Amino acid sequence: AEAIDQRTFRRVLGQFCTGVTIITTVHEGNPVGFACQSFAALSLDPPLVLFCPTKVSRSWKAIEASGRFCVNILHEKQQHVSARFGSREPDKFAGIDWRPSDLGSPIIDGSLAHIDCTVHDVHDGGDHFVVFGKVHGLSEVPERKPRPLLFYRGEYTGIEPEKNTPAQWRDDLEAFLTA
Amino acid sequence: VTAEAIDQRTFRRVLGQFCTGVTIITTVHEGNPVGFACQSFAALSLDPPLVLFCPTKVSRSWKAIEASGRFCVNILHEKQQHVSARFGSREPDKFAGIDWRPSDLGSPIIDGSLAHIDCTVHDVHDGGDHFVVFGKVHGLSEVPERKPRPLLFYRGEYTGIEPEKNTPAQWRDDLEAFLTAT
């Protein structure tokens, strides 16, 4: 009954659709990363983001040690990259083109956007941590078609661009960070 | 030394490249239903079962949620763009013309939503010009069943999925698996 309760959490929370990130660092010379969907924009002033690694994550411990990370937001053509980071295969950056950011963290070629960060604060979050990052630089790749990789009810998907609709807002007290 | 190095227009443009669902987060306070639209939501923990959301420090709804001690998260269907629009307006009664009923804890469920999650306030942290609020999950539901077509927000616009793109996914590394992985 414990395992069924956990299956229900996974299914119901899966109804909230998200993009997909790879969060990366370099620790003593080698590139390190993990796939993550528990990402959000947090604050404009100061500029902050958050992400939620598991308490058992090996990749987060490398980020904690360096104090630096880059967030790569994935394009739908990068489904293979996400699958690679999700596996137990060694040498995860093999065959994947990348370059260091201004702070030294891996930027993956072909992404929609990247965000160059330092670790700002860390909190306990049950069986996960919540990590705040301070933003030091960011950009989107020009002329790449805006088609994000999605994750919804346990499967990869993408958008139908014919559905794109302008949004108007008036309540300034509750403004989205991205409007 | 106080540093200002990030342009605000650039922040909004770049962070909009991360696509999200759309929620309405609700409570009852001083005999009235209260709610707001929010994209800063995430699944947080399995054991214990937790979620998080991030209201602005100036939020009217957060003051009501803080006082009552409880909230319900409603995940919207693509045909509910009109609900998100009303909650994003300055109308004095936002629940007018929108069908709703109380959850087991006593917070508004929006009829026609894809799913809802019934919570109590668990902890609260400072997050710059926002707060980060943790909720303890007491109930959750994805019925009555509706065709699985979520309302999305991407690059400052509403959108939706192409269901022909839906593809199964496998995850061998248990130490890093998503909370919602099958």
Numbering used by the authors:
A (entry chain A): 3 to 181
B (entry chain B): 1 to 182
The publication says:
Nitrilotriacetate monooxygenase (NTA-Mo) is an oxidoreductase and a member of the family of two-component monooxygenases which initiates the oxidation of NTA under aerobic conditions. This enzyme is comprised of two parts: component A (NTA-MoA), which has monooxygenase activity and is responsible for the oxidative conversion of NTA to iminodiacetate (IDA) and glyoxylate, and component B (NTA-MoB), a flavin reductase which consumes NADH to reduce FMN to FMNH2, which is a required cofactor in the oxidization step. The amino-acid alignment and the three-dimensional structure motif of NTA-MoB from M. thermoresistibile (MthNTA-MoB) associate it with a family of short-chain flavin reductases.
